[PDB]
Write an enzyme that holds these catalytic residues in place. Structure first.
Site, PDB file in Angstrom:
ATOM      1  N   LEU A  71     -57.016   4.409  18.471  1.00 18.10           N
ATOM      2  CA  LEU A  71     -57.127   4.175  19.908  1.00 18.10           C
ATOM      3  C   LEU A  71     -57.366   5.427  20.737  1.00 18.10           C
ATOM      4  O   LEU A  71     -57.752   5.343  21.883  1.00 18.10           O
ATOM      5  CB  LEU A  71     -55.876   3.483  20.430  1.00 18.10           C
ATOM      6  CG  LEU A  71     -55.552   2.109  19.888  1.00 18.10           C
ATOM      7  CD1 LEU A  71     -54.221   1.649  20.436  1.00 18.10           C
ATOM      8  CD2 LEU A  71     -56.651   1.155  20.277  1.00 18.10           C
ATOM      9  N   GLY A 102     -55.737  13.454  21.148  1.00 21.82           N
ATOM     10  CA  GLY A 102     -55.046  14.329  22.073  1.00 21.82           C
ATOM     11  C   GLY A 102     -55.289  15.699  21.500  1.00 21.82           C
ATOM     12  O   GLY A 102     -55.940  15.818  20.452  1.00 21.82           O
ATOM     13  N   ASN A 103     -54.791  16.745  22.151  1.00 21.22           N
ATOM     14  CA  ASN A 103     -55.006  18.082  21.606  1.00 21.22           C
ATOM     15  C   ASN A 103     -54.360  18.232  20.228  1.00 21.22           C
ATOM     16  O   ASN A 103     -54.894  18.915  19.346  1.00 21.22           O
ATOM     17  CB  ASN A 103     -54.527  19.157  22.590  1.00 21.22           C
ATOM     18  CG  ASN A 103     -55.522  19.426  23.701  1.00 21.22           C
ATOM     19  OD1 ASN A 103     -55.342  20.332  24.522  1.00 21.22           O
ATOM     20  ND2 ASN A 103     -56.603  18.649  23.743  1.00 21.22           N
ATOM     21  N   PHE A 104     -53.240  17.534  20.034  1.00 20.44           N
ATOM     22  CA  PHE A 104     -52.431  17.632  18.823  1.00 20.44           C
ATOM     23  C   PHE A 104     -51.784  16.295  18.413  1.00 20.44           C
ATOM     24  O   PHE A 104     -50.950  16.256  17.503  1.00 20.44           O
ATOM     25  CB  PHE A 104     -51.343  18.672  19.060  1.00 20.44           C
ATOM     26  CG  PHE A 104     -50.791  18.608  20.455  1.00 20.44           C
ATOM     27  CD1 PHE A 104     -50.482  17.380  21.043  1.00 20.44           C
ATOM     28  CD2 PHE A 104     -50.627  19.762  21.202  1.00 20.44           C
ATOM     29  CE1 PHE A 104     -49.991  17.313  22.334  1.00 20.44           C
ATOM     30  CE2 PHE A 104     -50.128  19.700  22.498  1.00 20.44           C
ATOM     31  CZ  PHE A 104     -49.813  18.473  23.058  1.00 20.44           C
ATOM     32  N   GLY A 105     -52.148  15.217  19.095  1.00 22.81           N
ATOM     33  CA  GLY A 105     -51.663  13.887  18.741  1.00 22.81           C
ATOM     34  C   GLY A 105     -52.752  12.839  18.597  1.00 22.81           C
ATOM     35  O   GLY A 105     -53.929  13.088  18.888  1.00 22.81           O
ATOM     36  N   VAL A 164     -53.314   8.178  18.525  1.00 23.32           N
ATOM     37  CA  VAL A 164     -52.734   6.858  18.725  1.00 23.32           C
ATOM     38  C   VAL A 164     -53.520   5.825  17.968  1.00 23.32           C
ATOM     39  O   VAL A 164     -54.730   5.707  18.141  1.00 23.32           O
ATOM     40  CB  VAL A 164     -52.629   6.503  20.216  1.00 23.32           C
ATOM     41  CG1 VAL A 164     -52.096   5.088  20.406  1.00 23.32           C
ATOM     42  CG2 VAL A 164     -51.720   7.486  20.918  1.00 23.32           C
ATOM     43  N   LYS A 190     -48.188   6.456  18.130  1.00 22.41           N
ATOM     44  CA  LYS A 190     -48.606   7.826  18.417  1.00 22.41           C
ATOM     45  C   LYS A 190     -47.919   8.698  17.389  1.00 22.41           C
ATOM     46  O   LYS A 190     -46.721   8.531  17.131  1.00 22.41           O
ATOM     47  CB  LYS A 190     -48.184   8.246  19.850  1.00 22.41           C
ATOM     48  CG  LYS A 190     -48.732   9.591  20.385  1.00 22.41           C
ATOM     49  CD  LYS A 190     -48.245   9.869  21.831  1.00 22.41           C
ATOM     50  CE  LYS A 190     -49.169  10.780  22.674  1.00 22.41           C
ATOM     51  NZ  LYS A 190     -48.633  12.185  22.950  1.00 22.41           N
ATOM     52  N   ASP A 250     -50.690  14.978  33.660  1.00 12.73           N
ATOM     53  CA  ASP A 250     -51.935  14.559  33.045  1.00 12.73           C
ATOM     54  C   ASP A 250     -52.522  13.302  33.677  1.00 12.73           C
ATOM     55  O   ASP A 250     -53.091  12.481  32.982  1.00 12.73           O
ATOM     56  CB  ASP A 250     -51.716  14.333  31.554  1.00 12.73           C
ATOM     57  CG  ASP A 250     -52.975  14.489  30.750  1.00 12.73           C
ATOM     58  OD1 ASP A 250     -53.997  14.898  31.306  1.00 12.73           O
ATOM     59  OD2 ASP A 250     -52.943  14.205  29.547  1.00 12.73           O
TER      60      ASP A 250
HETATM   61  C1  LIG Z   1     -50.486   2.933  24.147  1.00  5.79           C
HETATM   62  C2  LIG Z   1     -51.598   3.657  24.255  1.00  5.79           C
HETATM   63  C3  LIG Z   1     -52.715   2.731  24.211  1.00  5.79           C
HETATM   64  C4  LIG Z   1     -52.148   1.467  24.080  1.00  5.79           C
HETATM   65  N1  LIG Z   1     -52.903   0.396  24.012  1.00  5.79           N
HETATM   66  C5  LIG Z   1     -54.193   0.448  24.056  1.00  5.79           C
HETATM   67  C6  LIG Z   1     -54.839   1.660  24.189  1.00  5.79           C
HETATM   68  N2  LIG Z   1     -56.130   1.982  24.262  1.00  5.79           N
HETATM   69  C7  LIG Z   1     -56.235   3.255  24.383  1.00  5.79           C
HETATM   70  N3  LIG Z   1     -55.025   3.837  24.390  1.00  5.79           N
HETATM   71  C8  LIG Z   1     -54.863   5.273  24.528  1.00  5.79           C
HETATM   72  C9  LIG Z   1     -54.587   6.062  23.267  1.00  5.79           C
HETATM   73  C10 LIG Z   1     -54.979   7.492  23.609  1.00  5.79           C
HETATM   74  N4  LIG Z   1     -54.209   7.974  24.752  1.00  5.79           N
HETATM   75  C11 LIG Z   1     -54.407   7.171  25.955  1.00  5.79           C
HETATM   76  C12 LIG Z   1     -53.978   5.744  25.661  1.00  5.79           C
HETATM   77  C13 LIG Z   1     -54.103   2.842  24.271  1.00  5.79           C
HETATM   78  N5  LIG Z   1     -50.799   1.622  24.046  1.00  5.79           N
END
Ligand SMILES: c1cc2c(ncc3ncn(C4CCNCC4)c32)[nH]1
Length: 290
Positions: A13, A16-19, A21, A40, A134
């Site tokens: 999904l 990040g710089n270091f993470g 999801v 994450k 952010d």
């Molecule tokens: C938590 C995040 C999250 C989510 N559910 C759907 C998402 N789609 C992008 N993200 C991003 C992931 C990258 N960082 C920004 C949110 C989602 N639930």
């Protein structure tokens, strides 16, 4: 209380710089009837980076609000403690992508609805003395056509007991094109720095995320694209210092653009409050109605 074996990877999904999801399904019954969640984890796991994440997890676990993404839990092999944060999965994804896909459906009234929701969540944060640091549309999630939530807290910091700003300098890359001047010059982050970024978010919204009209592009266009490395930052500062600003987006009403510019006051204490912002946005909406 999530066990790693029952975590089935579906897709990425975000990064990040270091993470990162991932979309995963938690399926303990191995019957494929578990819920889909967001996970994450860390990419660089320095003892330093762990400290931060643990704190990020605490912060999120401590938030309970309609406009804030739900903390579902944590997971770790124990094990070398391979920490992972579990959050609810939002099916419409980031406001950034959503907005782009549906520009034709979403009118200004609707942008104001989301705008207002963001303010309410930001206001809730400031309530706990949390600085988001952010604010962006990538970082807003869309739960359904009528509701958004703030969906990431990797950079969120808690204010010291006795001070209204937090000074911090982050290794490598910063979203400078969303950063307030004092953040650029002093590394100072405050609620007010958050309001500055909100202004940019508002901007993002009314550009409907047209690529040529993004903050980085608009600022680089303004600074000149020959600039590189450190120089970019230095010109950025000079530019803002001289009241250079992002332009009113195509179609944006003056009253809306005015909100943006009030957010982009060089003068830190002359920036509106989230409560003020919400009221003004809501007032505007009401006037649109009739
Ligand atoms: C938590 C995040 C999250 C989510 N559910 C759907 C998402 N789609 C992008 N993200 C991003 C992931 C990258 N960082 C920004 C949110 C989602 N639930």
């Amino acid at each position: 209380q999530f066990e790693e074996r029952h975590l089935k990877f579906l897709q990425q999904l975000g990064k990040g710089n270091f993470g990162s999801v991932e979309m995963c399904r938690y399926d303990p019954l191995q019957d494929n009837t578990g819920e889909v969640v967001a996970v994450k984890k860390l990419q660089h796991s320095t003892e330093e980076h762990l400290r931060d994440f643990e704190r990020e997890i605490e912060i999120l676990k401590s938030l309970q609000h309609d406009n804030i993404v739900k903390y579902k839990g944590v997971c770790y092999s124990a094990g070398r403690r391979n920490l992972k944060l579990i959050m609810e999965y939002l099916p419409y994804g980031s406001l950034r992508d959503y907005l782009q896909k549906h520009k034709e459906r979403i009118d200004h009234i609707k942008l104001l609805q989301y705008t207002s929701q963001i303010c309410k969540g930001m206001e809730y944060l400031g309530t706990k003395r949390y600085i988001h640091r952010d604010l962006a549309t990538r970082n807003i999630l869309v739960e359904n056509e009528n509701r958004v939530k703030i969906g990431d807290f990797g950079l969120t910091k808690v204010l010291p007991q006795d001070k209204e700003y937090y000074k911090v300098k982050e290794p490598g890359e910063s979203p400078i094109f969303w950063y307030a001047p004092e953040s650029l010059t002093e590394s100072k982050f405050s609620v007010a720095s958050d309001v500055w970024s909100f202004g940019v978010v508002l901007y993002e919204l009314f550009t409907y995320i047209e690529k040529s009209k993004s903050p980085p592009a608009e600022f680089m266009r303004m600074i000149g694209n020959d600039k590189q490395g450190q120089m970019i930052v230095f010109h950025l500062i000079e530019l803002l210092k001289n009241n250079g600003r992002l332009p009113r987006p195509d179609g944006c009403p003056d009253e809306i653009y005015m909100i943006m510019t009030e957010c982009w006051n060089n003068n830190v204490n002359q920036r509106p409050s989230f409560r003020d912002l919400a009221l003004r946005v809501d007032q505007i909406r009401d006037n649109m109605a009739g």
